[PDB]
Amino acid sequence: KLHKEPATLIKAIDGDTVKLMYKGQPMTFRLLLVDTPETKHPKKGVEKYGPEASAFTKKMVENAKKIEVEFDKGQRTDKYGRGLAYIYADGKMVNEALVRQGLAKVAYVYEPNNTHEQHLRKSEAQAKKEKLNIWS
């Protein structure tokens, strides 16, 4: 079973990345299962909706009373050393919130790090149905 652990916000970096203090160590976390338009894309730089997704994540984590990270059942860090997790702001999953607002698409999922995949695909279907942002 997955479990939530407390973390402290250091700084929001992009729509899909946030720097947190986890167990006394500064770490960069990459939001699991979502692809957000970027402002720091290696090849493109700032993409359409990138500023929006970036501001949404920033607002959500900065205004939260409690931030929690939830690792999946597979590897906990990617090749760049970023923690791979589901981030919660006052009980609300940031990963899902972005998808629900049409500010992120469900990424190519890598089992076993796919626990909340169906949940996110459902939110994406709704955002698309409502033609929100990315889907407008």
From Swiss-Prot:
The active site is at 30, 38, 82. This is Nuclease A. Ca(2+) binds at residues 16, 35-36. Residues 116-136 are annotated as: Disordered. It is found in: Secreted. Residues 116-132 have a biased composition (Basic and acidic residues). It comes from Staphylococcus aureus. It comes from the Bacteria.
